[PDB]
Structure 1
Amino acid sequence: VDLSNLPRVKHTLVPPPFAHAHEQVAASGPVINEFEMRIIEKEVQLDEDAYLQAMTFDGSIPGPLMIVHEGDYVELTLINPPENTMPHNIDFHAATGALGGGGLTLINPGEKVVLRFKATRAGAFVYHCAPGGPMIPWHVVSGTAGCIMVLPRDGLKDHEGKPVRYDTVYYIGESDHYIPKDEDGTYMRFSDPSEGYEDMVAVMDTLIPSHIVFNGAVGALTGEGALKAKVGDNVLFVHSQPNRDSRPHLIGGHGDLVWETGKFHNAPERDLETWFIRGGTAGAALYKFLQPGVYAYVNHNLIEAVHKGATAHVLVEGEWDNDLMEQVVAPVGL
């Protein structure tokens, strides 16, 4: 108990897929990380004709990435603004006790709460809202879930215990939504989250999502929201899915070092084509880009990637290596 002598670092969170500033290898001993976030409830557009009455941490789906190191403390201030219409809370799978923080952070619109917990376990972990009861799933599939990554104090290590570093970390937040359709087969729009609850419950109960998206919308990470790398970059892709499985794959690439259950002191596997993110967790994969051009990072049920929304692109620069792959003879008539 105590802590008056640990340093405090106050952070400014940035919207996903980017991450707030940090260091892989901790620059000093345990600190108290201070974070603040508000619940913003608002309608979001998931696709060209599909909308969700969302509930979100800081206005974005997923909520922003938090990064700290193992042995640190996390003190979060959570605000539920007076214009929201429901109570929210927050459960950190990285924390120990009271339902992850969920039993000490229930706040009604108009209130705030400050939770502290010590980040004893290294890994990426989901956090998400869980107000109690029959509503808990409904708040997660309305968008309130993000991730906090607890890095080991000395940074990541590989399956032999040797240090490894990434040049860039992107947080891909995947989320399943259950938008109801009226009779003519078109998506329904509602005036706030409650009005749409009962119709959304009926679709939830079939367990088939109408949309599975990265970063909050079909296309959020393609086009202008494409991810970027260079040949030689070691990139860390952190991938959460708070309520339903996912099987990520980098098309054209591999997972060089993968922790698919997400906890960095376990040995990562090598050379994977596809890995698996259990619903309710965050895993992480490093890949060093060896060829330039366009890559798609997708949930490899391709129906879920292409029809429901779970595809991102990565644009990579650099020179092409024909010894890895060559079009020996371009398409030509038989």
Structure 2
Amino acid sequence: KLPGDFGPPRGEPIHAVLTSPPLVPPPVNRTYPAKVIVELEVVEKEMQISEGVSYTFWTFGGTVPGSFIRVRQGDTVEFHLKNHPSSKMPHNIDLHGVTGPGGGAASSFTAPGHESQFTFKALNEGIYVYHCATAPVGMHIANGMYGLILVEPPEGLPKVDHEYYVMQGDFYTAGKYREKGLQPFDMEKAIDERPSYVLFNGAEGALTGDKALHAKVGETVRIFVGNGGPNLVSSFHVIGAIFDQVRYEGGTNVQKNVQTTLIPAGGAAVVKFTARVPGSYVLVDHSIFRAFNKGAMAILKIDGAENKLVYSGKELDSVALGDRAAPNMSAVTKATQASVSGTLTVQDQVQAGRALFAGTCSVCHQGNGAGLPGVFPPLAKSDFLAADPKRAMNIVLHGLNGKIKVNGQEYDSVMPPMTQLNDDEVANILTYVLNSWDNPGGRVSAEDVKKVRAQ
């Protein structure tokens, strides 16, 4: 026998129902091998990789990651790849778990407006990455051409309350993190393995705030976790919880009771979580600058009764989650669009700066700008801020130390530089502060900050 030796296909041909992230198709719930027809279409399109930041993604099914495919070990899969006629590039597919050269690549080569097909038997149970394998392969994967296929064991997976679909990728923009506008792919950064963004499901905030995954206290969650790369290895981790089980691809080995697990580039794992106490559980790449400086954070939000005997503490806030504690940062998108249109108002800037102030400034100056007398000076009704708004731009870009006097009190501390903030971000944060807490109002422009940065 080969593995997956369950006989020829029986029953009727099945048209696979594919799902967009973060959702998963229902279990196949089948005791016989089937001919499964899969139809997947490549679409090239602009999407928001961050608020006010567009990127030309190349997608399987219009999403990053691509549509989720779910079949049964021993199935015969008739794979149809279409390339939308709006595409500029040819594309193909390499599915992990396929037995045969290129995992489908040579037979699935598809020009814009064409369709290709190949047939394979799913011999190998497991969770598997699929991706484009068109020269230059790294460019296609970097632009978002990856997803997951699940080959179920014949008896199916154990029932759980929720199944979700989460995939990490590293992304390479010409511009710096959160630099606004349409950002080209940067080949130099990709070859050097120096990503500008590291993301779950193709965007900053794709799985935070009002887009969090949900479950209730007492329920079981299974997450199909992919690492599309192209280049990075994920120190994949859940903050404040533990995985009951971690199983890689279709491996025989199952690790139980771990919190931190390494997912290779092109790798995939099935993780199981039991909800015990309510709150936000953060999925991160624990290579920490990825999670906290490049976007690599997703949320599983658990609702239900607190258990003070297990955990007496509060729900996560802007101290740890920064500007992603809030439901969304839609005001940044709106302020960026208004800048492009030449219609940016003070209130556009105030609402964008309000979103960006959380964590970034609030951890020390507080959400109300009061600070802590003698320790963190106030931004609320600040005489020092009002006396010199241009000095305030320098303070954000280049930091501040030494003795100062604010509202009649001496400070002798250190505010670190925040030079990685973009000109629009500094301008919008300071406009928010000037228009809050009885401050004098007016505005700071991106152009004002550009000139102070240039020194």
**TM-score, normalising length from structure 1?**
0.86
User: Structure 1 residues 187 and 326 mapped into 2: Cα distance closer, same or farther (>3 Å)?
Assistant: closer
Specify the SS of the correspondent of 1:224.
helix
CA–CA separation in structure 1 for the residues paired with 2:42 and 2:263: 26
User: Structure 1 residues 282 and 104 mapped into 2: Cα distance closer, same or farther (>3 Å)?
Assistant: same
- CA contact 1:94–1:119 (8 Å) conserved in 2: yes
Number of matched residues? 306
Partner of 2:159: 165
Give 1:207's match in structure 2, choosing from 184, 193, 198: 193
Q: What residue identity is the alignment partner of 1:319?
A: A
Give 1:247's match in structure 2, choosing from 225, 235, 241: 235
- CA contact 2:129–2:266 (8 Å) conserved in 1: yes
Give 2:259's match in structure 1, choosing from 273, 278, 286: 273
Specify the SS of the correspondent of 2:182.
coil
- CA contact 1:41–1:55 (8 Å) conserved in 2: yes
Residues 1:57 and 2:44 aligned together: no
Q: What residue identity is the alignment partner of 2:142?
A: V
Give 1:231's match in structure 2, choosing from 202, 217, 232: 217
1:119-158 alignment, distance < 5 Å: 119-132=122-135, 135-156=136-157
- CA contact 1:179–1:187 (8 Å) conserved in 2: no
Please give the per-residue CA displacement for 1:98-145, whole angstroms capped at 9, x wherever unaligned.
Answer: 20001110010110012221111111100000113xx10000010010
Specify the SS of the correspondent of 1:276.
strand
CA–CA separation in structure 1 for the residues paired with 2:116 and 2:18: 18
Please give the per-residue CA displacement for 1:44-103, whole angstroms capped at 9, x wherever unaligned.
Answer: 211124332110001100001111111112222110121111100000011011200011
Please give the per-residue CA displacement for 1:30-57, whole angstroms capped at 9, x wherever unaligned.
Answer: 1122221111001121112433211000
Partner of 2:421: none
Deviates more, 1:317-326 or 1:229-238: 317-326
Give 1:88's match in structure 2, choosing from 83, 86, 91: 91
Specify the SS of the correspondent of 2:110.
coil
User: Structure 1 residues 301 and 7 mapped into 2: Cα distance closer, same or farther (>3 Å)?
Assistant: same
Partner of 1:109: 112
Q: What residue identity is the alignment partner of 1:213?
A: L
**Any stretches of 5+ residues in structure 2 without a counterpart?**
315-455
Residues 1:217 and 2:220 aligned together: no
Please give the per-residue CA displacement for 1:296-325, whole angstroms capped at 9, x wherever unaligned.
Answer: 111111210111111111111222223322
Structure number with the bigger relative contact order (C-alpha 8 A, sep ≥ 6) is 1
CA–CA separation in structure 1 for the residues paired with 2:78 and 2:293: 40
Please give the per-residue CA displacement for 1:142-170, whole angstroms capped at 9, x wherever unaligned.
Answer: 001000011111134xxxxxxx4322111
CA–CA separation in structure 2 for the residues paired with 1:81 and 1:3: 33
Deviates more, 1:293-302 or 1:54-63: 293-302
**TM-score, normalising length from structure 2?**
0.64
- CA contact 1:50–1:179 (8 Å) conserved in 2: no
Q: What residue identity is the alignment partner of 1:56?
A: T
User: Structure 1 residues 154 and 5 mapped into 2: Cα distance closer, same or farther (>3 Å)?
Assistant: closer
Specify the SS of the correspondent of 1:125.
strand
Specify the SS of the correspondent of 2:138.
helix
CA–CA separation in structure 2 for the residues paired with 1:80 and 1:205: 27
Partner of 1:22: 27
Q: CA RMSD in A?
A: 2.1
CA–CA separation in structure 2 for the residues paired with 1:143 and 1:327: 38
Q: Report which of the two has the higher share of strand.
A: 1
**Higher alpha-carbon Rg:** 2
- CA contact 2:9–2:33 (8 Å) conserved in 1: no
Specify the SS of the correspondent of 1:140.
helix
- CA contact 1:180–1:187 (8 Å) conserved in 2: no
User: Structure 1 residues 327 and 172 mapped into 2: Cα distance closer, same or farther (>3 Å)?
Assistant: closer
Q: How far 1:4 moved relative to its partner?
A: 6.5
Deviates more, 1:202-211 or 1:84-93: 202-211
Specify the SS of the correspondent of 2:23.
coil
CA–CA separation in structure 2 for the residues paired with 1:224 and 1:102: 38
CA–CA separation in structure 2 for the residues paired with 1:73 and 1:5: 10
Give 2:182's match in structure 1, choosing from 161, 168, 189: 189
Give 2:284's match in structure 1, choosing from 298, 304, 311: 298
Specify the SS of the correspondent of 2:261.
coil
Partner of 1:321: 307
CA–CA separation in structure 1 for the residues paired with 2:79 and 2:145: 16
1:259-270 alignment, distance < 5 Å: 259=247, 261-263=248-250, 265-270=251-256
Specify the SS of the correspondent of 1:36.
strand
